[PDB]
């Protein structure tokens, strides 16, 4: 009726006329995303179509979560909403959902590949860092931070992204978490342990090392080598840790060949660091000591968000209004240990769009 068909790649876009001139910027882990102009508002905004949402109990749970989370999280570093709509009219008609949100200038995969300075890099770390702290401040782990999901503005801002997974620690592992990027998968994930708010930091760890090394920290050629690669770098884990890992995994992870591990003083020389020479608190050895406490195998000994923000490298940008920020409160409907039908996610998801406009 009042929407229009935008021939984009494969599935065609049927967005409001508000959004015109659609170009592709990426394809997240749900549908696809474009950087169109929203005349009505005056500024380029990202429209995300989740073509056929409720295919199954998966792309329908990651959605209801994405929806609610989107409308609940507000923060200077955690991307915000803007508009959500469905080109379909009737209750049955529904089969697609478009999401309009902010739109930076690039994605971290652009900085990673450039020579920052200190004050700066430390700001983004802080930046990105806070957003994280906030999201957690509601018992919400993201579980997927990685350049492909981090966005920085030319004015040097920065925002987290994709709340398609970011759930709460209510359930444990799964021998099918292969969805969360390898190079940024944390030990408790890999080893199918059981995550907590911390996991997110590890991601942030494999990040910095990337903002420093330029190469990705722990490659991996399969989810099973990932481990054989992370530990080849950080040494074989302390026996107590072993006692933690599930029965089976323990055996295998134990059989692995023993690795010395390298001190971060060599894992990140004084050279791979931004001109170590300004404003005390900063200093290369601090950018590192930071890592020194994030890149940690045993989940229970990893510098949590707070202490990170509360850390010599980060800290210099602290400020209660954007860190100890008000907790992004949740209603009382969200279900992390509960599933339904597709004709139910529909009613639920459809009844989760409508009102919105």
């Amino acid at each position: 009726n009042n929407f229009y068909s935008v021939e984009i790649g494969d599935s065609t876009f049927t967005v409001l006329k508000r959004y015109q001139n659609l170009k592709p910027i990426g394809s997240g882990a749900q549908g696809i995303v474009c950087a169109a102009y929203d005349a009505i508002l005056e500024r380029n905004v990202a429209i995300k179509k989740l073509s056929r949402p409720f295919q199954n109990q998966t792309h329908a749970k990651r959605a209801y979560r994405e929806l609610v989370l989107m409308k609940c999280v507000n923060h200077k570093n955690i991307i915000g909403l803007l508009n959500v709509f469905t080109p379909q009219k009737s209750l049955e008609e529904f089969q697609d959902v478009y999401i309009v949100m902010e739109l930076m200038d690039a994605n971290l995969c652009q900085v990673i590949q450039m020579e920052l300075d200190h004050e700066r890099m430390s700001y983004l770390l802080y930046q990105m860092l806070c957003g994280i702290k906030h999201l957690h401040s509601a018992g919400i782990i993201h579980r997927d931070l990685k350049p492909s999901n981090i966005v920085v503005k030319s004015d040097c801002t920065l925002k987290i992204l994709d709340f398609g997974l970011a759930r709460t620690a209510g359930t444990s592992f799964m021998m099918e978490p292969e969805v969360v990027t390898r190079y940024y998968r944390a030990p408790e994930v890999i080893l199918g342990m059981g995550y907590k708010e911390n996991v997110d930091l590890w991601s942030v760890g494999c990040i910095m090392g990337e903002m420093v090394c330029h190469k990705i920290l722990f490659p991996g050629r399969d989810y099973i080598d990932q481990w054989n690669k992370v530990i080849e770098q950080l040494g074989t884990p302390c026996p107590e840790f072993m006692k933690k890992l599930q029965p089976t995994v323990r055996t295998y992870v134990e059989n692995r060949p023993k690795y010395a591990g390298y001190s971060f003083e060599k894992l990140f020389p004084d050279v791979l660091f931004p001109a170590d020479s300004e404003h005390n608190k900063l200093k290369a050895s601090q950018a590192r000591d930071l890592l020194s406490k994030m890149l940690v195998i045993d989940a229970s000994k990893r510098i949590s968000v707070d202490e990170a923000l509360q850390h010599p490298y980060i800290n210099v940008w602290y400020d209660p209004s954007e860190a100890e920020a008000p907790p992004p409160k949740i209603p009382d409907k969200q279900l992390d240990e509960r599933e339904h039908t597709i004709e139910e996610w529909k009613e639920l998801i459809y009844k989760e769009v409508m009102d919105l406009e």
Partner: peptide
């Protein structure tokens, strides 16, 4: 000290 507000993304 105050944070920066640039970032040459080219």
């Amino acid at each position: 000290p105050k944070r920066p507000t640039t970032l040459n993304l080219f």
